[PDB]
């Protein structure tokens, strides 16, 4: 934790950070960068100061989502960040990475399913409720 360096994201940058246990992405800020590509980010969460500073593998931090993909532009096989609730699927939850799986549409209804990646595994064929709040994933 004492080998300070300079890589992909910088000290004080606002980023998104993946919780390892649940697999959800949270707004966060890089407090220091050390050397373990194979960099370690020391991160604090914006809305969770009581969680302290947490060590991140570089695969678990990226630029913050800024771009919403509109319904019309959603395609099966797209990998996106979207909001889902495992325990209560009809309610609002957290932001996970997911693969769009099914897209159905009538004159009055719209149905979106995705395979949602959640920490340790993958959950197939989840009905996504928040169909207008699907983010593009920021890649370098």
- The residues spanned by each domain of the chain are 1-66, 67-140
CATH topology of domain 1-66: SH3 type barrels. (2.30.30)
CB atoms within 10 A of CB 10: 10
* C-beta separation of 83 from 130 below 8 A: yes
* C-beta separation of 82 from 124 below 8 A: no
* C-beta separation of 111 from 127 below 8 A: yes
The residues pairing with 84 across neighbouring beta strands, listed in sequence order, are 94
Q: What is the resolution of this structure in A?
A: 2.4
- Edge to edge, the sheet with strand 94-105 lists 79-84, 94-105, 110-117, 122-128
* CATH class for the region spanning 67-140: mainly beta
What is the spatial distance between Cα 139 and Cα 137, in angstroms, rounded to a whole number? 6
* C-beta separation of 60 from 42 below 8 A: no
Which method was used? X-ray
* C-beta separation of 84 from 128 below 8 A: yes
- Residue 70, token pair as written in the block: 């509109």
Q: What is the DSSP string of 44-72?
A: EESS-GGG-EEEEEGGGEEEPP--BPPGG
- CATH topology agreement for domains 1-66 and 67-140: yes
């Amino acid at each position: 934790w004492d080998e300070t360096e300079l890589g992909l994201y910088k000290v004080n940058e606002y980023v998104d950070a993946r919780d390892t246990n649940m697999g959800a992405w949270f707004e966060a800020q890089v407090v220091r960068v050390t050397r373990k590509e194979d960099v370690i980010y020391h991160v604090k969460y914006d809305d969770y100061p009581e969680n302290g500073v947490v060590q991140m593998n570089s695969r678990d931090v990226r630029a913050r989502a800024r771009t919403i993909i509109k319904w019309q532009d959603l395609e099966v096989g797209q990998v996106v960040m979207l909001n889902y609730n495992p325990d209560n699927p009809k309610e609002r939850g957290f932001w996970y990475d997911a693969e769009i799986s099914r897209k159905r549409e009538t004159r009055t209804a719209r149905e979106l399913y995705a395979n949602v990646v959640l920490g340790d595994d993958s959950l197939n064929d989840c009905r996504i409720i928040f169909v207008d709040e699907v983010f593009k994933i920021e890649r370098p």
